[PDB]
Write a structure and sequence with these properties.
This protein is an alpha/beta fold. The chain has a single domain, classed as 3-Layer(aba) Sandwich (Dihydrofolate Reductase, subunit A). 20% of the residues lie in helices and 32% in strands. An eight-stranded mixed β-sheet has the order 5-4-3-6-1-7-10-9, sandwiched between helices. Strands 2-8 form a two-stranded antiparallel ribbon. Strand 3, helix 2 and strand 4 form a beta-alpha-beta unit. The longest helix is centred in the first third of the chain and has 11 residues. 27% of the residues are buried. The structure holds NADP nicotinamide-adenine-dinucleotide phosphate and calcium ion (CA). The site of calcium ion has 3 residues, from loops.
């Protein structure tokens, strides 16, 4: 199966020109928990923003610039490069999420209570086509700049 994992500010914002204006170590821990040793697919810009022991698949139209990871030129090649595995984790960014959302069966979302002026958004998903199977709210605290909610949705 294919899953997407993403951190969304209000209005589904996921990315900006520069680093995001927040500090959310709990979201990093959650991202690690749900990726671990599974294959990851990402776009070239996310890659520029590796883990041995797992397949790291980078989408780019151009030849790769780092032999430590696996470079592919199409969505079909990316899926093929992950092999037969229980779960493929698509970790960004916006262009890559848009292409894999119709193929995905699971979304792992972090809803962040922050308003940020961004240039990249998570794709529109119809909540009626998705079943929320897990949700967990957390307050901002000494380590996390904003409140945040972890949610897992499975496709209906
Ligand atoms: N392309 C542009 O016009 C351009 C220029 C400057 C800045 N930016 C900015 O970069 C920021 C990050 O965007 P993002 O989060 O969407 O990036 P992302 O998904 O992390 O990476 C997108 C990159 O992944 C590669 N890619 C995605 N789908 C592909 C496919 N089907 N086949 C082959 N390669 C594929 C392309 O790399 P390659 O580019 O290496 O082919 C593409 O540029 C955005 O803010 C955007 O405005 C875009
Ligand atoms: Ca960015």
């Amino acid at each position: 199966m294919i899953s997407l994992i993403a951190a969304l500010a209000v209005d589904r914002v996921i990315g900006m020109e520069n680093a995001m204006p927040w500090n959310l170590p709990a979201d990093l821990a959650w991202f690690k928990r749900n990726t671990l040793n599974k294959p990851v697919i990402m776009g070239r810009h996310t890659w520029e923003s590796p883990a041995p022991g797992r397949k790291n698949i980078i989408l780019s139209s151009q030849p790769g610039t780092d032999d430590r990871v696996t470079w592919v030129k199409s969505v079909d090649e990316a899926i093929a490069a992950c092999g037969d595995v229980p779960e493929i984790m698509v970790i960004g960014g916006g262009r890559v999420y848009e292409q894999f959302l119709p193929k995905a069966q699971k979304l792992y979302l972090t809803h962040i209570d922050a308003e940020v002026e961004g240039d990249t958004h998570f794709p529109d998903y119809e909540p009626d086509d998705w079943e929320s199977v897990f949700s967990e709210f957390h307050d901002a605290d000494a380590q996390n700049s904003h409140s945040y909610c972890f949610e897992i949705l499975e496709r209906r």
